[PDB]
Amino acid sequence: VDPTHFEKRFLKRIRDLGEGHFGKVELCRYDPEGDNTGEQVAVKSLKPESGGNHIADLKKEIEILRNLYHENIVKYKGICTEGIKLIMEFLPSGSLKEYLPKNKNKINLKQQLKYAVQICKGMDYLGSRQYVHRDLAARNVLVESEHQVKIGDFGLTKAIETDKEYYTVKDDRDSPVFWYAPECLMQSKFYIASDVWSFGVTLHELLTYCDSDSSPMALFLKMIGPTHGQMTVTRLVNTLKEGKRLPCPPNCPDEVYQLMRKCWEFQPSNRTSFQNLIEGFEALLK
Numbered sequence: 001v002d003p004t005h006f007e008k009r010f011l012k013r014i015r016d017l018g019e020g021h022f023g024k025v026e027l028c029r030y031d032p033e034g035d036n037t038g039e040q041v042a043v044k045s046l047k048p049e050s051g052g053n054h055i056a057d058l059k060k061e062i063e064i065l066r067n068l069y070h071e072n073i074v075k076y077k078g079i080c081t082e083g084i085k086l087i088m089e090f091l092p093s094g095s096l097k098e099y100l101p102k103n104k105n106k107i108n109l110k111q112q113l114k115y116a117v118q119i120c121k122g123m124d125y126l127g128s129r130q131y132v133h134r135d136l137a138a139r140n141v142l143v144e145s146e147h148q149v150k151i152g153d154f155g156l157t158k159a160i161e162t163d164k165e166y167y168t169v170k171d172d173r174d175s176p177v178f179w180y181a182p183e184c185l186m187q188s189k190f191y192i193a194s195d196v197w198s199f200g201v202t203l204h205e206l207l208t209y210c211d212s213d214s215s216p217m218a219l220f221l222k223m224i225g226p227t228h229g230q231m232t233v234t235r236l237v238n239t240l241k242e243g244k245r246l247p248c249p250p251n252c253p254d255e256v257y258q259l260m261r262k263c264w265e266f267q268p269s270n271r272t273s274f275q276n277l278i279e280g281f282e283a284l285l286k
């Protein structure tokens with residue numbers, strides 16, 4: 001028996017956990033014994049279509065996640081082969097986006113900063129292994145417990161070539177533009193420092209308990225105009241070049257806001273590092 005080999009005949013679909021353009025993530029029970037006692041798992045699969053081989057990308061995502069081992073990175077469980085399905089642990093609390101709005105009374109600033117540290121430890125591990133995530137947002141941060149988060153999705157993750165500072169693409173811009181650094185929006189280049197920018201926006205989300213009326217998309221559209229359509233991104237790049245940033249979350253101490261501002265230095269080289277963030281948060285927690 002290979003315990004990472006999940007037979008289709010035993011993998012029972014329960015419900016959708018999410019959708020994207022090219023695929024979905026479903027709650028399944030792997031129930032070899034057929035009595036509903038099998039373990040619940042999360043299952044990423046492509047909708048039958050995926051031309052610009054989404055299959056090749058999913059296979060590379062599976063290979064990335066199989067070889068990540070960190071307590072703040074969602075666990076690989078295995079595959080289901082037919083087309084292929086990525087099986088992961090199921091975290092029934094879901095993302096910070098579903099959990100924080102329901103648990104503000106539970107999650108105070110101290111716990112928010114611990115979650116901030118744990119995201120940074122995840123992200124520093126992925127950086128150490130020469131990857132750029134390119135999609136760091138609260139919707140991609142899963143709640144293991146009141147005390148623990150894990151980065152839960154690697155759909156856009158890429159290897160930076162050895163002796164390169166960044167990864168270029170212009171694949172499929174369903175891009176999360178309200179999470180992206182200017183060098184990402186302007187020149188489709190992604191540095192580790194780009195994920196640090198993305199982390200500052202995710203920190204803002206965590207500090208606003210992912211309220212939809214304070215979302216980075218809501219607040220940016222207020223700054224530039226909810227109009228604009230095909231002009232949005234320029235207008236956003238314009239806003240950033242003028243030095244405009246997301247405002248301090250209500251009740252966020254200036255010293256936390258100042259760590260978030262260091263994520264948002266226009267030049268990648270001018271940005272804080274994940275290691276420095278962990279230090280600044282740990283300082284604030286003592």
Ligand SMILES: C=Cc1cc(F)c(CN2CC[C@](CC#N)(n3cc(C(N)=O)c(NC(=O)OC)n3)[C@H](F)C2)cc1O
Pocket residue numbers: 017018019020022023024025026042044045046074088089090091092093094095139140141142151152153154155156
């Ligand atoms: C084909 C590509 C593709 C498809 C997609 F649907 C998504 C979108 N997506 C990612 C995984 C997601 C969020 C995270 N992190 N999630 C994982 C779990 C879990 N493992 O338990 C979970 N739990 C949950 O909601 O519990 C109530 N949510 C959620 F499914 C959304 C991204 C993609 O690249």
